[PDB]
Amino acid sequence: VGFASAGTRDIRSSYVEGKFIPQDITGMSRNHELDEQPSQECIGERILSFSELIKRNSWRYVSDEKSLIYPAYAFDNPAAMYTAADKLPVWTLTPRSGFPTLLTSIGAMYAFYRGGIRLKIVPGVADQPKPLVEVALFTMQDQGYIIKANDYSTDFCSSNIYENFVTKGIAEVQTPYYSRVNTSVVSAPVLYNAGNISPLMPNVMYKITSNSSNILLGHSAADDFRFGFLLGAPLAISATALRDNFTGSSATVSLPTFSNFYLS
């Protein structure tokens, strides 16, 4: 099409929309034309959208409360600190609502979202005598949109689902969008006064109860979920570098994974 120009020509939208078509350095567009053979012969699938990836579940948070109020639509990620000073752990992570998941990691690239989500729960202990888990829609206007041990004893007539840790083993829930608006804000700010009525997120949380002393919570997008308005790379650190221990202090960072959770 021409390698160079007098003035800007490679414009952000024009390229993505296919109106600006850069030339291959070899002059033969065939050299960068899609070839389907590789995925068919080597991979066995071909991923086309992050919409597919966020439907895969990942672990978000570990609770040590038998009955918990949990901020369903809070997509924030941990605060991180780094140091190369002697004898101090190199990396430290301090979560608010949980650790990063495919849902919150992909979400951090966008400003908005809409649609429902799914919840998965692994029990630390499947107690035979009291095997049930209840996940209830929690709507008290007074509650802050944060994690808190359940102290309520008056939330009658809620929407409840029951799963059995002994006959099944993992609890599976689907949460409707149930929003007062059609466009929510990813990691909207939660405040002291706030309560559970802000229009920036569905005014709905989870109340999770079981007889297991610990539970591992995970989530993913429901089938009607979407992220919108791409912003760019979110602030991030190398996940592999979390094993760093060059300061002489042993690495102490630990993400919520099944192996970390199930074994001590």
Partner: protein
């Protein structure tokens, strides 16, 4: 443009046909390609030649040019005498006459000079083993091929050195020195890599080996030369690069 230009484009008004650019700059310029280089000129150029220019007539060169033509592929397809190996009456069953890696054994200066400039290449390979015994001598050889020799499990390579029975199960051809004069084996290119890496040499795709199947049998001690000719076929070349074809 009689400058044997592969393509040419006056780009003077190009900026005037961009949808999101308004009142685009009119800038005299031209872009043209010659093989792997594209010249992007930002002003007028002049292209001159001899008055009434005529390239050298083809008939003028018949005194020296070959009626046959030769390209890179043609050179790689040329038979090459790869080696002459000794075979004598004292060698017993399964003695190794030779083992030649591919390409390695065919990487003569002629082949290297023509592959220079490419990242890699792949090809089928044809090997000829030739033996010229006289009518009163008898014996038998096996010419076989084994894939990715440097990365095959050791047990397999050992099996080949331990018993000729493990050579006979491989793709192979047998030579009876009293009946056939030469024997050929063609092997297609097979490897995890789509072409052989000329830059890092990471991994020869096959090896041709010749082992004694039945010893050279003569009334008194004797020896014969086992000669090898080889050439590539079904050649596929890589991509233009400045990387060195590794020694």
């Amino acid at each position: 443009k009689q400058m044997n230009v592969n393509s040419s484009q006056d780009t003077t008004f190009e900026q005037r046909s961009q949808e999101k650019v308004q009142a685009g700059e009119i800038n005299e310029s031209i872009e043209f390609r010659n093989q792997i280089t594209t010249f992007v000129h930002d002003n007028p150029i002049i292209t001159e030649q001899l008055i009434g220019d005529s390239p050298q007539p083809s008939g003028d060169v018949r005194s020296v040019s070959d009626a046959r033509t030769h390209s890179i592929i043609d050179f790689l397809e040329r038979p090459q005498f790869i080696g002459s190996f000794l075979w004598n009456t004292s060698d017993i069953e399964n003695k190794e006459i030779f083992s030649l890696k591919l390409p390695d054994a065919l990487m003569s200066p002629m082949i290297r000079e023509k592959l220079s400039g490419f990242t890699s290449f792949s090809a089928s390979t044809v090997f000829h083993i030739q033996v010229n015994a006289h009518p009163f001598q008898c014996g038998r050889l096996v010419l076989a091929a084994v894939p990715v020799p440097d990365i095959l499990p050791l047990h397999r390579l050992n099996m080949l050195s331990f018993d000729v029975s493990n050579v006979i199960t491989l793709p192979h051809v047998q030579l009876d020195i009293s009946k056939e004069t030469e024997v050929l084996l063609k092997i297609p290119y097979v490897s995890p890599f789509v072409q052989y890496d000329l830059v890092t040499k990471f991994t020869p795709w096959a090896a041709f080996l010749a082992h004694v199947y039945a010893p050279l049998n003569t009334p008194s001690a004797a020896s014969l030369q086992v000669n090898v000719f080889a050439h590539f076929e079904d050649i596929k070349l890589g991509f233009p690069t400045s990387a060195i074809v590794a020694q």
